[PDB]
């Protein structure tokens, strides 16, 4: 499924060369060779690669007719947890969250990547983690955020009684078996959940996924 020229192109992007060389530009982001290399085996993905891919999921969904998706920046959560609604209020200029269906919130833990899914169509939150960490409290903060967004942007409070939030069972969602693919799991969780697809991948696919993601980023086209 990966042409010999696709591989030759991926190999070229991951190979030797200056850090700063820009290899793909879109969404006001500039993915340099240094960013792309975090996609090498055993390497830790950075915010640039994740925000970029997340932006691709939104575009892909619009093009292939999947649910209206909205993705927050990897910087949103930390900013929220530290300055509350006021610090992130304007981060939604001219876009009504509630006109969306699936909302993705990437979550950066000091040295680990995580994902929160807000399904407006079912009014339920879900925390996804490849290393089984807990996130009940993260969803609470996010839900409170929605409430404040609703009252502040469309003068009407959410009926919290309708929303429900369940943390995913380590035996339901695939877990990572090593020490460096949490960023990858986060992106692939988001990918499958954006398409309402059962998360059926395993740690075994990660290497190919990594290879494919560099091609997908350079070509700004998913596979």
């Amino acid at each position: 499924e990966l042409t010999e020229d696709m591989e030759k192109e991926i190999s070229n992007a991951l190979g030797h060369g200056p850090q700063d060389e820009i290899l793909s530009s879109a969404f006001k982001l500039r993915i340099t060779r240094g960013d792309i290399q975090t996609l090498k085996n055993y390497h830790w993905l950075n915010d640039e690669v994740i925000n970029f891919y997340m932006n691709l999921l939104v575009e892909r969904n619009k093009k292939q007719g999947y649910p209206a998706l909205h993705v927050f920046s990897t910087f949103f959560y930390p900013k929220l947890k530290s300055g509350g609604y006021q610090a992130v209020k304007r981060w939604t200029k001219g876009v009504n969250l509630f006109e969306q269906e699936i909302i993705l919130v990437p979550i950066h833990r000091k040295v680990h990547w995580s994902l929160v899914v807000i399904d407006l169509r079912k009014k339920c939150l879900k925390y996804l983690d490849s290393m089984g960490q807990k996130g009940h409290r993260i969803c609470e903060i996010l839900l409170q955020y929605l409430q404040d967004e609703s009252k502040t942007k469309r003068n009407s409070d959410l009926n919290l009684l309708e929303w429900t939030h369940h943390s995913m069972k380590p035996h339901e969602i695939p877990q990572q078996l090593n020490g460096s693919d949490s960023g990858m799991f986060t992106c692939k969780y988001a990918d499958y959940i954006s398409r309402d697809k059962p998360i059926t991948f395993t740690q075994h696919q990660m290497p190919l996924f990594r290879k494919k993601m560099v091609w997908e980023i350079l070509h700004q086209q998913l596979l």
Partner: protein, 81 residues
């Protein structure tokens, strides 16, 4: 004309700047790095959660007086402790 932007880092610092609404923000960003002892590669300038390009201008981004530009450090991740 002249506008005043505030650059706020994650460490609680705030740096005041004065620029014309039609000046590309490049010089401001570069100056910020120099003063704060930061490296462009490792940080991220954001205006209301959106990234800023050196070629962007306060006008093109519709910035008002006393508006704030946020600065973030890079994030990396593989496994938790």
């Amino acid at each position: 004309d002249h506008i005043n932007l505030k650059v706020a880092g994650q460490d609680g610092s705030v740096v005041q700047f004065k620029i014309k609404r039609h000046t590309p923000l490049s010089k401001l960003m570069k100056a910020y790095c120099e003063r704060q002892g930061l490296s462009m590669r490792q940080i991220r300038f954001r205006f209301d959660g959106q990234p800023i390009n050196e070629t962007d201008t306060p006008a093109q981004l519709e910035m008002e007086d006393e508006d704030t530009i946020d600065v973030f450090q890079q994030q990396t991740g593989g496994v938790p402790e």
